[PDB]
Amino acid sequence: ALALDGKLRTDSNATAAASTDFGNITSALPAAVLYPSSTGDLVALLSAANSTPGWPYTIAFRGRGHSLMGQAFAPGGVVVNMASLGDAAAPPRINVSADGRYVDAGGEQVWIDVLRASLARGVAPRSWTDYLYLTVGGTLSNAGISGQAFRHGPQISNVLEMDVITGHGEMVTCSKQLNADLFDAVLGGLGQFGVITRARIAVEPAPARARWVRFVYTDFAAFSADQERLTAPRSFGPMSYVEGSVFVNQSLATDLANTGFFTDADVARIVALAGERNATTVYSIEATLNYAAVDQELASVLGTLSYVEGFAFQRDVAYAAFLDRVHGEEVALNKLGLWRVPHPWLNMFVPRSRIADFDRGVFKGILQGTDIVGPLIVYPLNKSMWDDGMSAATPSEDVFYAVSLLFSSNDLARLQEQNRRILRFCDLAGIQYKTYLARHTDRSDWVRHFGAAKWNRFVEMKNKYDPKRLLSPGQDIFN
Numbered sequence: 001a002l003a004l005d006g007k008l009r010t011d012s013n014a015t016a017a018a019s020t021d022f023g024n025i026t027s028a029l030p031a032a033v034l035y036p037s038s039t040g041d042l043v044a045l046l047s048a049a050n051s052t053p054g055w056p057y058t059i060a061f062r063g064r065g066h067s068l069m070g071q072a073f074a075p076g077g078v079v080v081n082m083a084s085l086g087d088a089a090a091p092p093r094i095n096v097s098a099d100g101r102y103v104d105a106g107g108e109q110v111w112i113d114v115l116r117a118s119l120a121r122g123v124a125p126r127s128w129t130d131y132l133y134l135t136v137g138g139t140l141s142n143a144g145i146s147g148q149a150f151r152h153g154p155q156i157s158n159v160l161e162m163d164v165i166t167g168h169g170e171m172v173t174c175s176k177q178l179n180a181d182l183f184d185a186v187l188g189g190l191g192q193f194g195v196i197t198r199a200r201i202a203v204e205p206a207p208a209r210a211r212w213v214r215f216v217y218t219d220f221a222a223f224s225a226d227q228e229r230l231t232a233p234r235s236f237g238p239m240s241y242v243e244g245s246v247f248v249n250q251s252l253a254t255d256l257a258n259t260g261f262f263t264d265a266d267v268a269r270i271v272a273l274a275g276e277r278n279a280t281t282v283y284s285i286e287a288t289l290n291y292a293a294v295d296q297e298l299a300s301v302l303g304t305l306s307y308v309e310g311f312a313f314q315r316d317v318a319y320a321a322f323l324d325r326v327h328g329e330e331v332a333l334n335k336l337g338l339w340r341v342p343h344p345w346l347n348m349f350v351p352r353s354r355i356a357d358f359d360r361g362v363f364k365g366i367l368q369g370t371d372i373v374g375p376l377i378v379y380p381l382n383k384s385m386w387d388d389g390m391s392a393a394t395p396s397e398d399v400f401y402a403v404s405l406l407f408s409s410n411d412l413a414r415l416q417e418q419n420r421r422i423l424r425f426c427d428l429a430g431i432q433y434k435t436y437l438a439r440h441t442d443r444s445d446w447v448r449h450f451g452a453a454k455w456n457r458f459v460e461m462k463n464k465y466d467p468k469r470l471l472s473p474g475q476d477i478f479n
């Protein structure tokens with residue numbers, strides 16, 4: 001049926017394309033790839049899976065395959081090419097609500113397109129990822145974090161409702177008011193319970209511009225204290241976005257220039273600063289204020305901070321330009337053949353109480369004396385803005401840090417060992433981190449990830465919504 005209609009492909013090019021991901025480290029050939037033209041085809045697939053005894057195929061939902069470690073693979077299974085849902089010219093896959101208070105987006109849609117559609121209506125999502133060519137369904141299945149998350153929560157905290165087709169092949173609309181168990185499970189649910197075909201995303205009146213600053217520190221305590229200051233509840237301070245990066249001495253200039261923010265002169269200034277202080281590591285807060293009035297507001301905020309005087313750097317850009325800043329990096333890196341490489345990224349949430357220890361062991365320790373290519377991103381998040389009833393797992397402390405070591409790779413083996421070492425350091429130090437964007441490979445690691453209570457709920461939802469354990473096997477939780 002589907003196949004005859006050409007929707008279910010088994011040819012080598014189709015399975016090949018669905019067998020690799022952004023991580024470019026692991027690969028797994030599916031048996032087939034579904035190219036659905038409508039949600040009806042997804043229902044048909046999942047209904048078949050549900051009602052067929054001896055159904056052979058796990059099923060993954062490939063957004064854009066930005067997964068790092070095969071999370072979007074269905075080894076010997078069926079990969080759904082979600083992008084196909086957005087092929088048709090009509091009907092539209094992104095609808096800003098009549099009142100401009102939300103935007104309905106197909107799960108297959110990429111956030112860059114959600115942004116463009118929203119802006120046409122004078123609005124925009126309030127919580128982002130740093131990189132916009134990811135799908136709605138994909139980020140919502142994880143959490144979706146960027147510099148706004150401290151005040152707006154992750155993207156999963158900014159969803160009104162969703163349409164989900166479960167493992168039972170049943171199309172369900174869910175929200176806090178209806179099928180809340182599914183709603184909660186799916187958000188941060190790692191594709192385990194059903195495919196998100198539509199997510200209803202909160203929006204706010206779109207700011208036109210962003211004042212965009214980088215603040216430089218050689219003192220991690222001051223750096224982290226200032227980040228916590230900027231993201232502390234008042235309701236929140238004025239900053240619209242707060243992240244940070246770490247630059248190890250050995251690749252200081254290179255990594256500084258790689259931000260795409262500092263001029264070569266800025267870089268020289270910072271290297272000199274680091275040199276005059278014999279600093280092994282430099283830190284930079286990255287913050288924006290969406291909007292003469294900006295000048296004084298910015299001055300007032302900056303006046304509460306303790307970055308190195310003379311080391312506040314300022315850009316002023318259109319809001320959309322800031323949001324899509326990373327696309328330019330990709331376009332550039334790709335031209336140098338440095339985008340499509342192995343990405344042994346290490347992402348975790350580190351409890352505030354141990355972030356200084358992490359800094360000591362990793363940034364001042366393990367990572368020292370290496371040539372780092374890729375941002376080392378560090379910034380605090382407020383647990384209060386996360387819904388613990390959702391599948392996403394975060395540390396127990398009110399404040400935890402997103403730590404994203406975006407290593408680009410004989411380097412691969414070294415980098416992989418380095419990550420094991422970082423993890424070993426954290427385990428030995430008793431740092432109660434949570435991984436983000438990582439898949440574990442045994443039960444005990446996953447149970448530890450979620451914690452006993454949340455794991456048990458996770459399993460309860462799996463039994464309810466994907467009893468055959470077909471969905472997103474590449475997460476290696478139930479597969």
Ligand SMILES: *Cc1cc2c(cc1C)nc1c(=O)[nH]c(=O)nc-1n2C[C@H](O)[C@H](O)[C@H](O)COP(=O)(O)OP(=O)(O)OC[C@H]1O[C@@H](n2cnc3c(N)ncnc32)[C@H](O)[C@@H]1O
Binds near residue numbers: 062128139143146195
């Ligand atoms: C590639 C990358 C990723 C990335 C990023 C920058 C780069 C260049 N920056 C991020 C950031 O700033 N903040 C953040 O939270 N995440 C960031 N990412 C990681 C990204 O979120 C993940 O890669 C995520 O998977 C989204 O990527 P994508 O949309 O391409 O999804 P996928 O990898 O193909 O699939 C991931 C898992 O989710 C399941 N899935 C996919 N779509 C659905 C729907 N519609 N419904 C239910 N489940 C879905 C897949 O089965 C897979 O398990």
Ligand SMILES: *[C@@H]1O[C@H](CO)[C@@H](O[C@@H]2O[C@H](CO)[C@@H](O)[C@H](O)[C@H]2NC(C)=O)[C@H](O)[C@H]1NC(C)=O
Binds near residue numbers: 091094095104105106
């Ligand atoms: C955007 O809104 C339109 C309604 O105008 C939706 O289009 C309809 O979609 C349903 C089911 O997908 C179809 O049966 C109808 O034929 C469509 N109507 C029109 C006017 O073409 C569309 O689904 C919405 N998109 C999202 C993601 O919610």
Ligand SMILES: c1ccc(CNc2ncnc3[nH]cnc23)cc1
Binds near residue numbers: 130
């Ligand atoms: C957590 C945080 C960030 C990411 C990925 N963002 C990202 N990816 C690539 N380049 C960047 N430059 C600035 N931000 C980024 C993934 C998980």
Ligand SMILES: *[C@@H]1O[C@H](CO)[C@@H](O)[C@H](O)[C@H]1NC(C)=O
Binds near residue numbers: 020021027340341342
């Ligand atoms: C990684 O990408 C290269 C292309 O540079 C490709 O040849 C290789 O097969 C990929 N490996 C994996 C595991 O995706």
Ligand SMILES: *[C@@H]1O[C@H](CO)[C@@H](O)[C@H](O)[C@H]1NC(C)=O
Binds near residue numbers: 046048050051168
């Ligand atoms: C799922 O399968 C059960 C029997 O195994 C059947 O009763 C139910 O109607 C099915 N649902 C769908 C949507 O296929």
Ligand SMILES: *[C@@H]1O[C@H](CO)[C@@H](O)[C@H](O)[C@H]1NC(C)=O
Binds near residue numbers: 251278279
């Ligand atoms: C920084 O690294 C450079 C080589 O890249 C080295 O010359 C210098 O000694 C390092 N600085 C410190 C403070 O260790």
